[PDB]
Amino acid sequence: AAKDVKFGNDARVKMLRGVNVLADAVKVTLGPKGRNVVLDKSFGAPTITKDGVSVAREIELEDKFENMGAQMVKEVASKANDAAGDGTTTATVLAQAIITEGLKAVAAGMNPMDLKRGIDKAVTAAVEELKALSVPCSDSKAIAQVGTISANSDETVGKLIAEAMDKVGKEGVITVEDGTGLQDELDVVEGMQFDRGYLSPYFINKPETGAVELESPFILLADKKISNIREMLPVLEAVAKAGKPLLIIAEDVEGEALATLVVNTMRGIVKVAAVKAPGFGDRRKAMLQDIATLTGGTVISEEIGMELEKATLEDLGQAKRVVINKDTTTIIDGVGEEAAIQGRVAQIRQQIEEATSDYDREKLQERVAKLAGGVAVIKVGAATEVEMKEKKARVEDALHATRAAVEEGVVAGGGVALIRVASKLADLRGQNEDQNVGIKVALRAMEAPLRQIVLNCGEEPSVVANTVKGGDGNYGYNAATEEYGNMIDMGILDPTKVTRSALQYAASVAGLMITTECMVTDLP
Amino acid sequence: AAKDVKFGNDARVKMLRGVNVLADAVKVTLGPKGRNVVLDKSFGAPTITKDGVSVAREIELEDKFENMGAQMVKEVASKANDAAGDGTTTATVLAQAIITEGLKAVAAGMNPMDLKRGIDKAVTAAVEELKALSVPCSDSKAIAQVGTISANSDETVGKLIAEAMDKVGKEGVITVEDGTGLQDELDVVEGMQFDRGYLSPYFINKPETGAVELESPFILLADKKISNIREMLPVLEAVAKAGKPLLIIAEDVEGEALATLVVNTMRGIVKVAAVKAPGFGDRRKAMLQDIATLTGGTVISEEIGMELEKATLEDLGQAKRVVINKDTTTIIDGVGEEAAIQGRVAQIRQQIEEATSDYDREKLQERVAKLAGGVAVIKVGAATEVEMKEKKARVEDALHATRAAVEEGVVAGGGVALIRVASKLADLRGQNEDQNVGIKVALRAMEAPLRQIVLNCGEEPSVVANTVKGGDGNYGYNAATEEYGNMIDMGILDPTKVTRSALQYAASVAGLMITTECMVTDLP
Amino acid sequence: AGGGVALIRVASKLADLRGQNEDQNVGIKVALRAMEAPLRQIVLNCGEEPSVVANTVKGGDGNYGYNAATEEYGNMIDMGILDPTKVTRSALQYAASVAGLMITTECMVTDLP
Amino acid sequence: AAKDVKFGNDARVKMLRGVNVLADAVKVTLGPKGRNVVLDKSFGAPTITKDGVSVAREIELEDKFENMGAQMVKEVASKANDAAGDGTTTATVLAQAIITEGLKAVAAGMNPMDLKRGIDKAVTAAVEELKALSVPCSDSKAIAQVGTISANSDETVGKLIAEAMDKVGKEGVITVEDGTGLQDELDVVEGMQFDRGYLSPYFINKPETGAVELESPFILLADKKISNIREMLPVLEAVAKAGKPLLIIAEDVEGEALATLVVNTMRGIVKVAAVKAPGFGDRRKAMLQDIATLTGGTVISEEIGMELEKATLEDLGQAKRVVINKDTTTIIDGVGEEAAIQGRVAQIRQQIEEATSDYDREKLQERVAKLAGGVAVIKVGAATEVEMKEKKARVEDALHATRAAVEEGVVAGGGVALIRVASKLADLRGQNEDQNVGIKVALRAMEAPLRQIVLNCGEEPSVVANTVKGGDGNYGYNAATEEYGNMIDMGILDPTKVTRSALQYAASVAGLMITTECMVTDLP
């Protein structure tokens, strides 16, 4: 169709307006004293939330260019959230600060490419300094303590997370499930997780969680790409008459098969989720065989000559529960007898010692580790439905935060890690004066989030920023208690991964938008 | 879809306008001298009502932001009504007062978070003082007296309520049914009540009552989640052939099963209501088995192997009458042989003495109490059918008021409890000047409802408010008789729970709205 | 101590004043913030952060203040920044008088456009 | 009356628009290949001119704020022209460049005060560099060469200027008059020049030169400030009866006397020019006594006793010709016995002998030098009257240029002195980054005039600017011949005073606009 094209200053002004709207919408929900945003719903009861993720998801502007700016900032912020589990609001406010200052500099006649170079240099230095400033969270005590912080200062969640990581390992798989009794239950089941996600968002059983969840589903193990529904239609009918959901994993699902499966998911006659097989090639085939061994099913391979049409219910894999997210798929408690898994891991180990290349050996190490480690299941127990659901949500959030912490440690939260990093990097310089301007822009932008937090608190932003800059280490201004001190001791912690990802994604999107010259959108 | 976003002062002004419209619509219907509001209907006959609940339910504005403000106040007022059975008008007028004064202070530059702290601190102090000021309502004479007041000064209704409470207990289940003869009849039948509600509002048989009511319905008892209708086409068709209503309770009903049941209800071919099972896990299964013992049916348990496909009409439980409300579900006179009930309660009792933990013993004691107490059915009768229906409605509302009274006592009605509480709390202070201003806002807000009542009476509001403030205890102003006195003796009562819930919900919504900075809604 | 620091010092030492009515207390707070204002305006003209400089001058004592020309603190008397006490007193008193007259103003009468 | 007030960015934008209009109007007439601008006249015949002075004098915009910007740039450019005799266009284009870049930087958020400081620092360093790069114009050969260059490469004018300067001295007074014969005549007459000028432009006899010229006028000498017309009314009547012009010099002329004299000049009945007395205090009285000795008149001193009523035509001083300009007043060939002049100069020499302080000695030395030096009169002759007038104008222009040259030497003209100086100063730095930005702004603005000249020539500005920057000394680009070389050798000479004054005045006005924040103008 006919397109509308904006060039140079006008395009950047429109992006600035859109980003300003989105960032003003999401920034008020930042900090312990964060305000709340009223979101309309078609049902009639407005939703009052302090969560910046929902506010960002709701935002969409009428103007097409402003919509572009808001949508791209939203996309990078959501990428930050997916990578880290938090920091969407921080990423968005950082992006707004960088974009505002960089576009002001560009309108001043600076060179946009040199500004982007300076921004990237400052952000790389900031990431290195944050890695320096992070304190490790490897011990069980620190794991439990950060878990307690993440779950709104609840020690039970922290001790559960610490026990789970002690049982399975900090690299192990931990999943939260509903617990029948009042007491919490932790156990190790046979399962595995891989990085493949659902093929279509319409498979999502729980939109609030944003992930596909199935109870006692059937596993389909195919070595060929699925394109025609007729190939597996008898298997689909057998699953439907069985009454249990079906999970299909293969090389790929495309075309009319995917379309009809998605249509069935809207219809609800048969609940089937489509996930690609992990990896590619011989490694993909090997991992499919491992999944078949785990679930007790059999893989459908073309080279064997056996086909999908003759496949029946008994040939399918079965598991107690599976969780599929857009970034990963988790298989929990597949029905596979222990001796089969023991023989599988034993032959994997013998393949390990007979192998020579380091890359293959490492890949087979991680394969056997994810096969034999299993999945630790945390059964959240409570007395009431609402309190049980709230506790489960808190446990999930704390699990994400603690995973980030054990990955990369924890820095001083509350937006003071960035202010400390900017204070220590204030001496950085670039090749060109424009690069120096970009570096200064990045430093001021990293200043911004703490200023926003203390503005939400109602206190003076500049005074608090100066006071925190004067200090050193983890010294900072606790927003909740309105008093300065050591952030680590006061319990205001942010995982290093969260802050690092927020800063990096905000910098990337801000550089992309600063170096933007033209737009192409549909006409109004 | 494109969204319209307001920030700061504009958003709060729009919310203030919407709340002002809703509160002006519902406030004139407050007090004995309350005016009436004409609500249009599509049929052609306008409805003249003095009930604030209907006026609130009918209010919906064209401006999206004003609509969201009005809808938030409506939702919290409805929550107050559900919790207490009255006070929707009081909750709405209190919310309007707090919101107006708090937004004026915010526009003055006051800190919104500190204002909210002052508001909810003053409200907590007010709740404590109200608990101090309440008089007990445990004795049968006081129960009858408050019931008489509730039913427009009718001693027969109070006598019936007092007799029912004596027969079953203040914690027992009491239900009102139409009486065949003129004389009112009370009897105790085997039944039990749980807090689960209907899954969809489309199940409501009587919209005026707002609850699902069935006559001699069939009870379905499943330990599995209900998603597929194909599991229970046979029993549904058998019930349809029998022609009796069907009530289904299981872990959950959703998806195509829920859709087709709602379709059947809207078509009217089969009357089926869907209600979840109480509790979760082992206690949920035990309560489902208790309901099976009560109704004489059998629980479709997956671990047993029994399936809904092979379920027969004799397997379904049967009850004389069931009432389903969004807050709770009541089973009345379930047809099941008594010796099963005594055996089940003896089994629960022996479980009690073999039980050890306090939590399990308390849960088992509650279960056995609700199983053995039964349901006391009040068969209200009259000479004429129309006056019999009117008397049934009066008995229902008096029963709700008396349940609230026996829950938390009663205070002086007519809006003088709040003015007395404000008079005694006038010396409260907060940490900051902003908290003090919030406390003053809350106190003036608690003053407001009596002013509105005496304004509807046409008398001067300030003079009456000052005169009531000068007094003490339950001394107040009677709106009907236009002369002061002891409101407890003069028959102007309000249950303590009603006033407490109204104040708390108004405070919560006003705090949410005062600290609101951003509003997101669809474009016009 | 000229340069607008006499008023901020006076406000710092008067921060504990109280009145009979709460509105009187609010009016006193208004007067104190207004007394803070001129130094903030000067340091805004200088391009420096107003709140930080105002806080730093408040934390000091005596004639210690901030010099606009040299952009650094110190004793304002010895740094050559002098304002006669009559000038500051008259400015404050006349500003207070006009602000009181306008705050308590309810009606204005003017010719038509 | 009512005023329109603009604050901050919009006011500066209005300045930028007005300055852009004026600078684009005058900047096309820059360089040998300069275009011409058509100026409307009420008479009907438009004026086509390549002179930036007239174009600037004609510019006046309709928007009041843009009018302010244009008018103040015009005023500073006129001051530069008055001080140096040339450089209005260069000053205006430099001011436009500085203002544009400075306003862009201010919009970038740089501190305007720091930008002004950096601009002033760069301009001071540039004045030092210009002094370093200037070559002296002391020798008579260089004086003749500069005079020849100024008068469109005419050897005769340069020779006349050089020989007149050798005859009377570089500090001496040289005046150009119409020549009776074909040959050019130079003679030295007794006269002096002081820096006082006419009170109001309404005294201007010839608007083309902007100066008052009188043929054989009468001189009035009063030691009192003239305020009442009736005091000198008999003198005015006697002058009008005589029919010759009158020149009045006293402490000041104000009030009704000034009004009547202006009215008489406008009507033309009496042609009298009013000039203030030179100096102040006893110095003023001594200078009036010197004037009386020179012109043979008598000083009307109140303390001595004579009154302006008693003054007669014989007491009035008489001169052959006088020229009055707003910068200075010249008395040429005042009639008076040489014996009186010799006695007066001997008196001044004996005050030299008796004087002690260096200041008084220097002042008396200046007085005796300017009294005994006389006035050199250049009588320009030609074949016809019109070319005689053209030659007289060229001679006057060359005289001004040569006076500037002997004052401060000459530099490489054609706008390459500024680019050379900027190349030298490219390593300058300031205390703050904003000062560095101001310095860079000044340097690029210094580049600007050469770019404008070579753009008028049709060549690429950037390539020529880079080529000139690559060279050194007086190496540059000749605009007329479109080929590089040495400005001094090719005769493209600009007096150092002209470039210095243009640069300084442009810097001053640009700083004034950069530090401008508010405006007050009458409403449209």
Could you give the topology of this structure?
This is part of a larger assembly, with 4 copies of chain A.
Chain A: E1 3-4, H1 9-27, E2 36-39, E3 47-49, H2 52-58, H3 64-84, H4 88-107, H5 112-133, H6 140-150, H7 155-168, E4 173-178, E5 185-189, E6 192-194, E7 212-215, E8 218-221, H8 229-242, E9 246-250, H9 256-267, E10 272-276, H10 282-295, E11 317-324, E12 329-334, H11 338-354, H12 358-372, E13 375-380, H13 385-408, E14 410-412, H14 416-425, H15 433-456, H16 461-470, E15 475-478, E16 483-486, H17 487-490, E17 493-495, H18 496-514, E18 521-522
Parallel strand pairs in A: 4-13, 8-9, 9-10
Antiparallel strand pairs in A: 1-18, 2-3, 5-13, 6-12, 7-11, 8-11, 11-12, 14-17, 15-16
PDB class: chaperone
Keywords: cryogenic electron microscopy, single-particle analysis, molecular motion, structure-function relationship, focus classification, separating heterogeneity, groel, chaperone, unfolded protein
Entry title: Cryo-EM structure of double occupied ring (DOR) of GroEL-UGT1A complex at 2.7 Ang. resolution
